[PDB]
Design a protein around this ligand. Structure first.
Ligand SMILES: Nc1nc2c(ncn2[C@@H]2O[C@H](COP(=O)(O)OP(=O)(O)O)[C@@H](O)[C@H]2O)c(=O)[nH]1
Ligand SMILES: Nc1nc2c(ncn2[C@@H]2O[C@H](COP(=O)(O)OP(=O)(O)O)[C@@H](O)[C@H]2O)c(=O)[nH]1
Ligand SMILES: Nc1ncnc2c1ncn2[C@@H]1O[C@H](COP(=O)(O)O)[C@@H](O)[C@H]1O
Ligand SMILES: Nc1ncnc2c1ncn2[C@@H]1O[C@H](COP(=O)(O)O)[C@@H](O)[C@H]1O
Ligand SMILES: [Mg+2]
Ligand SMILES: [Mg+2]
Lengths: 431, 431
């Protein structure tokens, strides 16, 4: 009561695209507030309800709920054009009056056109040299966060304030990036002029995030939902550095991105796919480059929800799962895409790693090591049956139930939900 | 029990140098583990016990305790030379076998010599232009964090691994900074060669931070202490941006810098000076540029614990205090330097801000606004008496007790400790 109302969190336990948009949407139906705390439009959250399919990137997935306000915390990095582009895309799909239910924290940073530009420049520059890069989405997320750290970036509040002072700051930040990539050209006045538009357009939805969020957690009880982006192993600190994103997708990112204390955090749900996927470059212990990987890739439709780039696929990997829990402290799990395994006669799942006939004690801080480990697999009987229609724990068949426990057990975290489809109803609740 | 043992946190509520080193030391006597989660040697924590005076920067203030292990989490940025320089400085002061009780998280980033260099370059470059800069400590903290965000920086684990691959990465990171400051010269082989030394020297204290910290919080009960650096209004997200430091000094930084979940966080203590001080550039609502400021400056010895640069001083400011609590969620307060006010006949303390005869509703996201506010002051009777010897709540005189309540009340947070001196015993405990 004195502490306040506690926040419910939905986070990624692997390398993103675990189905956070799906889980968030299910819990949002109730929610008074749904918000984002980290990342930018590099994120890609797909929601499927009553026949329509959405794909949000900056917009909180609860935006769909008219009876709820959607929030974008200070931790997030926003690319104005990209924001509106996304809104338009969804408006022409049924989304209406979203503006009246969207709130932008005035402390969040801005992804400027050139940030996205140098991001690409940075990638090709890495390829043309090492012949190996990160595999960024080229949305400037990296550069924006690096600008933020340097305290050179610009924030929503700076945009609404005196444009003259803004334009000066803008001028210098642009000239600075050009110093890194003297090839990078920037049409200052163009962007600047378009920015003034965006400013006056974004202005009504902007507010003090700290105050806003504080008022909501200490006033009359409210159901607040925090939608995480990316995932645990993509976390700037704990992920497979440097093959990660530039924000803390782990639980700390919630306090960082919204400005709320730990006691105001309640249930922390770890969304975990029934198998593993990674879109960018970097170590992937269980990766299956064969007919299996192809099957998962195809039955799971694991491809660029925009670019069409198929994602790397592999078996379930408990090492990353447990390491993710050590950092996040999940209160319960969301096990998604079980239906994808309905076909397999037997399912393997990585339980531990060993370097030289030697089982390593914990997840490697050095990603380069992770790339040289031999994983020990456990082979589990498949249930070989269609579960897309299961809606209760008893609908699921033997091996299927055992597969849930298996995950539930080796992670020492109970599974609260089981996903068997993309839509809101294609979900089973264990308790 | 299932959750684990909870961590005690000590954080800054103003603009740093509130006396965290003092509070941490008092609580460390007990502690099994004392650790740092953010910042670098830019920090400056002074401890005074049994006649000796210390000033740590990277070394956790509990280092003094032989019966305890000192930890440096992944969130921190380490400058090897600076680390050892500090250790030596303290060894020649009584510190012995610290190496046997210090542990470095293998995921923390490295502040390279050039980082400190470009930091200075960046400052002068800001002065020679705008005639206004940040007032950094010139320790590369900023550049290191910007490298980290870009995923270009290097970590402890990268240092211990194949030096050949390290040296290559190093080579490129250095050439990159030179592209920003083509004036900046870097003796690659020199630093590189010295780094190999540091590597083999730091090697024995390095360990997997996530695992280490996890084992300690879920195994047999332990008393773990987290020593925060800098302070709330210096927080990269919530402080007076851009006039802040490049890390999250707020509570989220604990989960970010150590990799521990929110439920593993317990008491969060806000250290608050009985008056306000800021060392660098930026808005300072209550700043007193006169005989008062001089008095506080002199009775409080508020000067560079190294450079000798006197710090800006001003009355207590409740606006920043409450805003700090909104973000940190202090479980109790540590009110330091009460003795400094023993002389004043009457003490003023800022209670709210008003822009144009209009009282602003909350702390300004835009620092430039904060610079144009007129604060409303409350004048409180001084106790005019020496409290340096007070050790119990009843030792303190009337107006003194009322001053504590005043803070305790307007912040809606109980004051757990009252500081009346620099030493460990110069402290009163209210409960
Ligand atoms: N068949 C099936 N697809 C699912 C399930 N859960 C989620 N999906 C789909 O898997 C994809 C995951 O991609 P994505 O939306 O990026 O997840 P996010 O990034 O974590 O929000 C989406 O297209 C979802 O519709 C499930 O239980 N079954
Ligand atoms: N007189 C007096 N000095 C104090 C008290 N508490 C702390 N100090 C001193 O105030 C200074 C604060 O600077 P600093 O060590 O940077 O604090 P930190 O950066 O928060 O650890 C130190 O020199 C302390 O010894 C107190 O109650 N009374
Ligand atoms: N929406 C996303 N889904 C999955 N992985 C992502 C997503 N956005 C970024 N990543 C990963 O994050 C890493 C860094 O890319 P970026 O986030 O663009 O800086 C890469 O390995 C990407 O594959
Ligand atoms: N040890 C410290 N004590 C107080 N303020 C600090 C300290 N270190 C950095 N700051 C402040 O942090 C801001 C950014 O400097 P830096 O932390 O060096 O990037 C400046 O306004 C400094 O005054
Ligand atoms: Mg996605
Ligand atoms: Mg200090």
């Amino acid at each position: 009561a004195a502490t306040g109302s506690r926040v419910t969190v939905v986070l990624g336990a692997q390398w993103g695209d675990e189905g956070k948009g799906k889980v968030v949407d299910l819990l949002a139906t109730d929610a008074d507030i749904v918000s984002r705390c980290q990342g930018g439009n590099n994120a890609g959250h797909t929601v499927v309800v009553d026949g329509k399919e959405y794909d949000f990137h900056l917009l909180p997935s609860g935006i769909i709920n008219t009876k709820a306000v959607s929030f974008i915390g200070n931790g997030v990095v926003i690319h104005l054009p990209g924001l509106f582009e996304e809104a338009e895309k969804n408006e022409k799909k049924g989304l209406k009056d979203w503006e009246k239910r969207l709130i932008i924290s005035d402390r969040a940073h801005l992804v400027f056109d050139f940030h996205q530009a140098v991001d690409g420049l940075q990638e090709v520059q890495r390829q043309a040299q090492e012949g190996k890069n990160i595999g960024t989405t080229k949305k400037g997320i990296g550069p924006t966060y690096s600008s933020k750290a340097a305290r050179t970036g610009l924030r929503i509040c700076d945009l609404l304030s005196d444009f003259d002072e803004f334009s000066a700051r803008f001028k210098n930040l642009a000239h600075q990036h050009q110093s890194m990539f003297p090839t990078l050209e920037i049409d200052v006045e163009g962007q600047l002029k378009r920015l003034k538009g965006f400013a006056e357009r974004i202005r009504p939805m902007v507010r003090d995030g700290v105050y806003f969020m504080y008022e909501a957690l200490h006033g009359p009880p409210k159901k607040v939902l925090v939608e995480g982006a990316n995932a645990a192993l993509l976390d700037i600190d704990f992920g497979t550095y440097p093959f990660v994103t530039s924000s803390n997708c782990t639980v700390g990112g919630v306090c960082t991105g919204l400005g709320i204390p730990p006691q105001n955090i309640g249930d922390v749900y770890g969304v975990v796919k029934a198998y593993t996927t990674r879109v960018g470059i970097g170590a992937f212990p269980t990766e299956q480059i064969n007919e299996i990987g192809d099957l998962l890739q195809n039955r799971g439709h694991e491809w660029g929800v925009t670019t069409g780039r198929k994602r790397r696929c592999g078996w379930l990997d408990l090492m990353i799962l447990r390491y993710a829990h050590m950092v996040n402290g999940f209160t319960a799990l969301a096990l998604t895409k079980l239906d994808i395994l309905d076909v397999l006669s037997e399912i393997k799942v990585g339980i531990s790693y060993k370097l030289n006939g030697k089982r390593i004690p914990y997840f490697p801080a050095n990603q380069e090591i992770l790339q040289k480990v031999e994983v020990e697999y456990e082979t589990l009987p498949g249930w070989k049956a269609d579960t897309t229609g299961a809606r209760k724990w008893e609908d699921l068949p033997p091996q299927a139930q055992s597969y849930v426990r298996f995950v539930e057990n080796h992670m020492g975290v109970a599974v609260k939900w089981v996903g068997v489809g993309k839509s809101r109803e294609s979900m089973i609740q264990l308790f």
